[PDB]
Design a protein around this ligand. Structure first.
Ligand code: HEM
Ligand SMILES: CC1(C)C[C@H]2C=C(C(=O)O)[C@@H]3COC(=O)[C@]4(CO4)[C@]23C1
Length: 397
């Protein structure tokens, strides 16, 4: 008997930690230690998907004496309207009601066109530079920040101002830096709201200002803009990096995609399913039980913490034959869990898919000899950030 402790070591730079796969082989649910409270860890696809759809399991903490959290985690939960268990139902319902129509088919069609042209231009710059080049800085970082500038209706140079604010806000290692960064996000968004009130455009805050005949306060609208800014680019950057690394590891699939860019949607779904970095602490969706829930032969009690391992579930052989293999020829693959499921299903997931498809339609056709210029083992996943990620991806081509 040895209680497992999150996070688990991963000897590889990607994939699932061996001890989490070991727990998965034993059963769907295990009690584990963490850096804070003990929690139930759920690692199999069926059970993770069932529990993400169970409304007894919520982001908000119902406990009378809640455990302490990093400033990074507190900001994240607040931005998700989960900081008060008594008001989370109405506040989270309103959050989703106000954000979902900001990603209409009209907006996504226009943005798809601009995204495709932007990747062409980014790759043209990449192709003309002398290697070695940091693919993360010149491609992975630039497309999603471009997209967020578009959603917010601000000049593209603004991304040089806000480009590290998701990383700083979600720095679990430095509470002072987290709060100082979040204050900069807040000041920026409040400036942005005040400008949009006299100079609206075709963008998200303008639409929120017009909403319900202007019934929302500037703080309400800035709060929603902060969620788009801090959730809307950093995780996409990370997926472009992991997708590139994954395709570099599988030359046969890479060659298939270069030959037929019609495989890019299939490649994108495989990248999302398998794209897990380092110790993979960001591939856990945290919850608290607001009522008792049975999972197999285990009772989750009201108040317990639960870690739903979407990364481990996406590797589950029970749901994906040869779950550890990158295969863009899978016939009717199950829907992966990388955008979550149920009440808090990723609001940006169709836009994120459009970005990832535009990149991987083009990347290896435009740069056929692209490859890492450093060993994989030199690539360092940033464990202290909620959103993880690599800081650089040196390439040659
Ligand atoms: C590939 C990139 C992305 C990934 C892997 C991702 C992943 C996720 C996941 C797993 C959740 C569920 C959180 C939970 O269940 O507690 C979530 C929620 C969310 N995502 Fe995404 N996301 C991505 C891109 C985006 C983009 C581009 C946007 C907007 C522009 C966005 C906006 C949101 C918001 C607002 C939520 C909160 C939903 C809620 O709590 O109701 N995300 N995302
Ligand atoms: C709102 C989020 C940014 C989306 C989710 C994806 C993430 C990621 O890919 O890094 C974040 C990691 O931390 C979490 O709690 C998550 C898993 O829910 C995320 C919160």
């Amino acid at each position: 008997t040895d209680l497992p402790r999150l996070p688990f070591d991963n000897p590889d730079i990607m994939g699932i930690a061996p001890q989490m796969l070991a727990l998965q082989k034993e059963g769907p649910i295990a009690r584990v230690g963490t850096a804070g409270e003990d929690a139930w860890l759920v690692t199999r696809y069926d059970e993770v998907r069932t529990l993400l759809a169970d409304r007894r399991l919520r982001l908000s903490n119902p406990n009378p004496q809640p455990s302490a959290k990093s400033a990074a985690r507190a900001f994240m939960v607040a931005l998700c309207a989960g900081d008060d268990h008594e008001t989370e139902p109405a506040r989270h319902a309103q959050m989703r009601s106000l954000l979902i129509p900001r990603f209409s088919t009209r907006r996504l069609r226009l943005m798809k066109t601009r995204i495709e042209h932007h990747v062409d231009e980014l790759l043209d710059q990449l192709a003309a530079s002398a290697p070695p080049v940091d693919l993360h800085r010149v491609l992975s970082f630039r497309l999603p920040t471009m997209v967020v500038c578009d959603l917010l209706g601000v000049p593209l140079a603004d991304r040089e101002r806000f480009g590290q604010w998701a990383r700083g806000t979600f720095d679990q290692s430095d509470n002072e830096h987290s709060a100082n960064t979040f204050q900069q996000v807040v000041d920026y968004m409040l400036e942005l709201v005040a400008r949009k009130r006299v100079e609206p455009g075709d963008d998200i805050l303008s639409e929120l200002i017009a909403e319900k005949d202007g019934a929302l306060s500037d703080a309400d609208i800035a709060h929603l803009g902060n969620a788009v800014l801090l959730f809307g680019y950093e995780t996409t950057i990370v997926r472009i990096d992991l997708g590139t690394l994954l395709l570099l590891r599988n030359p046969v699939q890479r060659a298939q995609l270069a030959e037929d860019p019609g495989l890019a949607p299939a490649a994108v779904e495989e990248i999302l399913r398998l794209g897990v970095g380092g110790k993979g602490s960001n591939a856990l969706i945290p919850r608290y039980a607001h009522g008792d829930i049975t999972v197999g032969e285990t009772v989750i009690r009201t108040g317990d913490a639960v870690m739903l391992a979407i990364g481990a579930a996406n590797y589950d052989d029970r749901a994906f034959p040869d779950g550890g293999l990158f295969d863009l020829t899978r016939v009717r693959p199950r829907s992966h869990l990388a955008f979550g499921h149920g009440a808090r299903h990723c609001i940006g997931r169709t836009l994120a898919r459009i970005e990832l498809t535009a990149v991987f339609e083009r990347l290896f056709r435009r740069l056929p000899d692209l490859r890492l210029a450093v060993p994989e083992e030199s690539l360092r996943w940033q464990e202290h950030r909620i959103t993880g990620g690599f800081d650089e991806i040196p390439v040659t081509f």
